[PDB]
Structure 1
Amino acid sequence: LESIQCDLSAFPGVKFFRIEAIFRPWRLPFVIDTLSKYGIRGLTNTPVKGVGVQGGSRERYAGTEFGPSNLVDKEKLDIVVSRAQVDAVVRLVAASAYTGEIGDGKIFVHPVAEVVRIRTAETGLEAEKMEGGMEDMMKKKK
Protein backbone atom coordinates (compact mmCIF):
# COMPACT_ATOMS: atom_id res chain seq x y z
CA LEU A 1 0.00 0.00 0.00
CA GLU A 2 2.75 2.39 1.02
CA SER A 3 4.40 1.14 -2.29
CA ILE A 4 1.69 1.24 -5.02
CA GLN A 5 2.95 2.24 -8.48
CA CYS A 6 0.68 3.86 -11.03
CA ASP A 7 1.18 3.21 -14.69
CA LEU A 8 1.47 6.52 -16.65
CA SER A 9 3.22 4.96 -19.65
CA ALA A 10 0.29 5.56 -22.08
CA PHE A 11 0.71 9.32 -21.42
CA PRO A 12 4.27 10.16 -22.15
CA GLY A 13 4.85 13.87 -22.41
CA VAL A 14 1.99 14.69 -20.05
CA LYS A 15 3.03 16.85 -17.05
CA PHE A 16 -0.09 16.88 -14.88
CA PHE A 17 -2.50 14.29 -13.60
CA ARG A 18 -5.75 14.38 -11.65
CA ILE A 19 -6.01 11.97 -8.75
CA GLU A 20 -9.71 11.30 -8.18
CA ALA A 21 -10.41 9.38 -4.95
CA ILE A 22 -13.79 8.04 -3.84
CA PHE A 23 -14.09 6.77 -0.21
CA ARG A 24 -16.04 6.65 3.06
CA PRO A 25 -17.52 9.98 4.15
CA TRP A 26 -16.22 9.85 7.71
CA ARG A 27 -12.65 9.46 6.38
CA LEU A 28 -12.68 12.85 4.69
CA PRO A 29 -11.13 14.84 7.48
CA PHE A 30 -8.37 12.25 8.13
CA VAL A 31 -7.46 12.20 4.43
CA ILE A 32 -7.37 15.98 4.10
CA ASP A 33 -5.15 16.27 7.19
CA THR A 34 -2.76 13.66 5.97
CA LEU A 35 -2.41 15.46 2.66
CA SER A 36 -1.97 18.79 4.44
CA LYS A 37 0.89 17.42 6.66
CA TYR A 38 2.69 16.40 3.45
CA GLY A 39 2.24 19.64 1.52
CA ILE A 40 -0.81 18.80 -0.64
CA ARG A 41 -3.10 21.77 -0.06
CA GLY A 42 -4.85 22.27 -3.42
CA LEU A 43 -7.80 19.85 -3.54
CA THR A 44 -11.56 19.74 -4.36
CA ASN A 45 -14.27 17.78 -2.50
CA THR A 46 -17.61 16.70 -3.90
CA PRO A 47 -20.08 14.54 -1.96
CA VAL A 48 -21.33 11.75 -4.24
CA LYS A 49 -23.07 8.37 -4.19
CA GLY A 50 -21.92 5.18 -5.82
CA VAL A 51 -22.11 1.46 -6.33
CA GLY A 52 -19.24 -1.05 -6.27
CA VAL A 53 -20.78 -4.49 -6.38
CA GLN A 54 -18.39 -7.38 -6.47
CA GLY A 55 -19.91 -10.81 -6.62
CA GLY A 56 -22.86 -11.18 -4.30
CA SER A 57 -21.54 -9.53 -1.17
CA ARG A 58 -23.21 -6.40 0.11
CA GLU A 59 -21.56 -3.44 1.75
CA ARG A 60 -22.63 -2.14 5.03
CA TYR A 61 -23.36 1.62 5.56
CA ALA A 62 -25.45 3.26 8.37
CA GLY A 63 -25.97 -0.23 9.77
CA THR A 64 -27.71 -1.44 6.71
CA GLU A 65 -26.57 -3.44 3.79
CA PHE A 66 -26.52 -2.17 0.23
CA GLY A 67 -26.33 -4.29 -2.90
CA PRO A 68 -26.88 -3.96 -6.63
CA SER A 69 -28.65 -0.79 -7.62
CA ASN A 70 -28.53 0.85 -4.12
CA LEU A 71 -26.51 4.09 -4.19
CA VAL A 72 -24.35 4.56 -1.11
CA ASP A 73 -22.83 7.80 0.13
CA LYS A 74 -19.16 8.50 -0.47
CA GLU A 75 -16.91 11.53 -0.45
CA LYS A 76 -14.86 12.35 -3.55
CA LEU A 77 -11.57 14.23 -3.70
CA ASP A 78 -9.95 15.59 -6.89
CA ILE A 79 -6.24 16.48 -6.57
CA VAL A 80 -4.26 17.85 -9.53
CA VAL A 81 -0.54 17.35 -9.28
CA SER A 82 2.62 17.06 -11.32
CA ARG A 83 3.79 13.68 -12.70
CA ALA A 84 6.52 13.21 -10.01
CA GLN A 85 4.09 13.62 -7.13
CA VAL A 86 1.44 11.08 -8.39
CA ASP A 87 2.62 7.81 -6.74
CA ALA A 88 3.17 9.58 -3.38
CA VAL A 89 -0.24 11.21 -3.29
CA VAL A 90 -2.04 8.02 -4.32
CA ARG A 91 -0.28 6.20 -1.45
CA LEU A 92 -1.27 8.79 1.15
CA VAL A 93 -4.99 8.74 0.21
CA ALA A 94 -5.07 4.95 -0.01
CA ALA A 95 -3.37 4.52 3.33
CA SER A 96 -5.53 7.00 5.28
CA ALA A 97 -8.89 6.00 3.80
CA TYR A 98 -8.22 2.25 4.27
CA THR A 99 -10.22 0.09 6.75
CA GLY A 100 -10.17 -3.30 5.15
CA GLU A 101 -13.88 -3.75 4.41
CA ILE A 102 -15.62 -3.75 1.04
CA GLY A 103 -16.66 -0.27 -0.08
CA ASP A 104 -13.28 1.24 1.17
CA GLY A 105 -12.99 3.01 -2.18
CA LYS A 106 -11.40 3.46 -5.59
CA ILE A 107 -8.75 5.81 -6.91
CA PHE A 108 -8.52 6.86 -10.59
CA VAL A 109 -5.68 8.81 -12.25
CA HIS A 110 -6.46 11.10 -15.22
CA PRO A 111 -4.26 13.14 -17.58
CA VAL A 112 -4.47 16.92 -17.40
CA ALA A 113 -3.27 19.36 -20.12
CA GLU A 114 -3.19 22.80 -18.47
CA VAL A 115 -3.54 24.57 -15.14
CA VAL A 116 -4.37 28.29 -14.68
CA ARG A 117 -4.53 30.37 -11.47
CA ILE A 118 -7.23 33.02 -11.95
CA ARG A 119 -5.96 35.66 -9.55
CA THR A 120 -2.55 35.94 -11.21
CA ALA A 121 -2.99 34.48 -14.70
CA GLU A 122 -0.11 32.10 -13.98
CA THR A 123 -0.08 28.87 -16.08
CA GLY A 124 1.47 25.42 -16.07
CA LEU A 125 4.12 24.79 -13.47
CA GLU A 126 3.70 28.22 -11.86
CA ALA A 127 -0.09 27.72 -11.52
CA GLU A 128 0.09 24.19 -10.17
CA LYS A 129 2.79 24.94 -7.60
CA MET A 130 1.71 26.01 -4.11
CA GLU A 131 3.86 28.15 -1.85
CA GLY A 132 4.79 26.06 1.22
CA GLY A 133 3.79 22.88 -0.65
CA MET A 134 5.33 19.42 -1.14
CA GLU A 135 7.83 20.72 -3.64
CA ASP A 136 9.06 23.46 -1.34
CA MET A 137 9.11 21.15 1.70
CA MET A 138 11.46 18.73 -0.18
CA LYS A 139 13.79 21.64 -1.09
CA LYS A 140 13.83 22.69 2.62
CA LYS A 141 14.56 18.94 3.53
CA LYS A 142 17.41 18.68 0.79
Structure 2
Amino acid sequence: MKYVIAMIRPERLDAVKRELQKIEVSRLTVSSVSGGYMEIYRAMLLEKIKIEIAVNDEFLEPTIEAIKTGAKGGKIFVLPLENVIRIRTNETGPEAI
Protein backbone atom coordinates (compact mmCIF):
# COMPACT_ATOMS: atom_id res chain seq x y z
CA MET A 1 0.00 0.00 0.00
CA LYS A 2 0.93 3.68 -0.37
CA TYR A 3 0.00 7.00 1.19
CA VAL A 4 0.49 9.72 -1.42
CA ILE A 5 0.89 13.40 -0.50
CA ALA A 6 1.16 16.00 -3.28
CA MET A 7 2.02 19.70 -2.85
CA ILE A 8 0.71 21.43 -6.00
CA ARG A 9 0.39 25.04 -7.14
CA PRO A 10 -3.13 25.96 -5.96
CA GLU A 11 -4.18 26.94 -9.54
CA ARG A 12 -3.73 23.30 -10.66
CA LEU A 13 -5.85 21.63 -7.97
CA ASP A 14 -8.68 21.05 -10.44
CA ALA A 15 -6.44 20.14 -13.38
CA VAL A 16 -4.97 17.26 -11.37
CA LYS A 17 -8.42 16.30 -10.03
CA ARG A 18 -9.44 15.92 -13.68
CA GLU A 19 -6.58 13.52 -14.46
CA LEU A 20 -7.16 11.85 -11.08
CA GLN A 21 -10.74 10.80 -11.93
CA LYS A 22 -9.63 9.48 -15.34
CA ILE A 23 -7.85 6.49 -13.75
CA GLU A 24 -10.55 5.79 -11.11
CA VAL A 25 -8.85 7.71 -8.28
CA SER A 26 -11.47 9.52 -6.21
CA ARG A 27 -10.33 9.17 -2.55
CA LEU A 28 -8.32 12.37 -2.02
CA THR A 29 -8.03 15.12 0.59
CA VAL A 30 -7.15 18.75 -0.09
CA SER A 31 -5.35 21.01 2.36
CA SER A 32 -4.06 24.58 2.16
CA VAL A 33 -0.38 24.77 3.08
CA SER A 34 2.70 26.89 2.35
CA GLY A 35 6.38 26.14 1.67
CA GLY A 36 14.33 33.99 -3.58
CA TYR A 37 12.09 34.24 -6.63
CA MET A 38 9.04 35.42 -4.64
CA GLU A 39 10.96 37.94 -2.51
CA ILE A 40 10.22 40.92 -4.85
CA TYR A 41 6.48 40.58 -4.06
CA ARG A 42 6.49 40.91 -0.25
CA ALA A 43 5.22 44.55 -0.31
CA MET A 44 2.30 43.64 -2.65
CA LEU A 45 6.73 31.16 2.09
CA LEU A 46 4.29 30.73 -0.84
CA GLU A 47 0.93 29.00 -0.55
CA LYS A 48 0.68 25.46 -2.00
CA ILE A 49 -2.06 22.80 -1.99
CA LYS A 50 -1.58 19.51 -0.09
CA ILE A 51 -3.39 16.47 -1.54
CA GLU A 52 -3.41 13.15 0.34
CA ILE A 53 -4.20 9.86 -1.43
CA ALA A 54 -3.94 6.21 -0.43
CA VAL A 55 -3.62 4.03 -3.52
CA ASN A 56 -2.92 0.40 -4.27
CA ASP A 57 0.43 -0.66 -5.73
CA GLU A 58 -1.37 -1.27 -9.03
CA PHE A 59 -2.52 2.38 -9.12
CA LEU A 60 0.70 3.98 -7.84
CA GLU A 61 2.11 4.71 -11.31
CA PRO A 62 -1.26 5.90 -12.70
CA THR A 63 -1.71 8.09 -9.61
CA ILE A 64 1.62 9.94 -9.84
CA GLU A 65 1.51 10.54 -13.61
CA ALA A 66 -2.04 11.80 -13.19
CA ILE A 67 -0.64 14.31 -10.67
CA LYS A 68 2.42 15.04 -12.82
CA THR A 69 0.41 15.85 -15.97
CA GLY A 70 -2.25 17.96 -14.24
CA ALA A 71 0.40 19.92 -12.30
CA LYS A 72 3.01 20.40 -15.03
CA GLY A 73 0.65 22.40 -17.27
CA GLY A 74 5.43 21.02 -6.81
CA LYS A 75 6.58 17.73 -5.31
CA ILE A 76 5.01 14.28 -4.90
CA PHE A 77 5.86 12.39 -1.71
CA VAL A 78 5.57 8.62 -1.90
CA LEU A 79 5.27 7.05 1.51
CA PRO A 80 5.39 3.41 2.70
CA LEU A 81 1.95 2.99 4.30
CA GLU A 82 1.34 -0.42 5.93
CA ASN A 83 -2.23 -0.11 7.30
CA VAL A 84 -5.41 1.37 5.73
CA ILE A 85 -8.75 0.51 7.40
CA ARG A 86 -12.28 1.76 6.43
CA ILE A 87 -14.37 3.05 9.36
CA ARG A 88 -17.83 1.62 8.55
CA THR A 89 -17.05 -1.86 7.22
CA ASN A 90 -14.19 -3.11 9.47
CA GLU A 91 -12.14 -3.25 6.25
CA THR A 92 -8.37 -3.70 6.22
CA GLY A 93 -5.49 -2.97 3.90
CA PRO A 94 -6.21 -3.48 0.20
CA GLU A 95 -9.93 -3.96 0.86
CA ALA A 96 -10.27 -0.66 2.74
CA ILE A 97 -8.96 1.84 0.16
Aligned-residue CA RMSD (Å): 1.8
Instruction: Write out aligned runs for 1:21-32 (5 A).
Output: 21-32=6-17
TM-score (norm 2): 0.87
Give the length in aligned residue pairs. Answer: 95
User: Are the counterparts in 1 of residues 23 and 63 from structure 2 also a CA contact under 8 Å?
Assistant: no
**Superimposed CA distance per residue, residues 25-81 of structure 1 (whole angstroms, 9 cap, x where no aligned partner):** 11111111221122001111111000xxxxxx5148xxx647xxxx10010111111
Q: TM-score scaled to structure 1, two decimals?
A: 0.61
Q: Which has the higher contact order (CA 8 A, sep 6+)?
A: 2
Q: Which has the greater radius of gyration?
A: 1
In structure 2, stretches of 5+ residues that fail to align are: none
Structure 1 distance, partners of 2:15, 2:78, is: 21
**1:54-69 matches, cutoff 5 A:** 58-59=37-38, 65=41
C-alpha separation between the residues in 1 aligned to 2:50 and 2:63?
15
3-state DSSP of counterpart to 1:84: coil
Which of the residues 108, 112, 115 maps onto 2:77? 108
Counterpart of 2:16 in structure 1: which amino acid? V
Percent identity, please: 36
Q: Secondary structure at the match of 2:90?
A: coil
Separation in 2, partners of 1:90, 1:43: 13
Asked if 1:39 corresponds to 2:13, the answer is no
CA drift of 1:121 comes to 1.1
**Structure-2 change in CA distance of 1:20 and 1:65 (3 Å):** same
1:20, distance to aligned residue in structure 2 (A): 1.1
Runs of 4+ in 1 over 2 A off after TM superposition: none
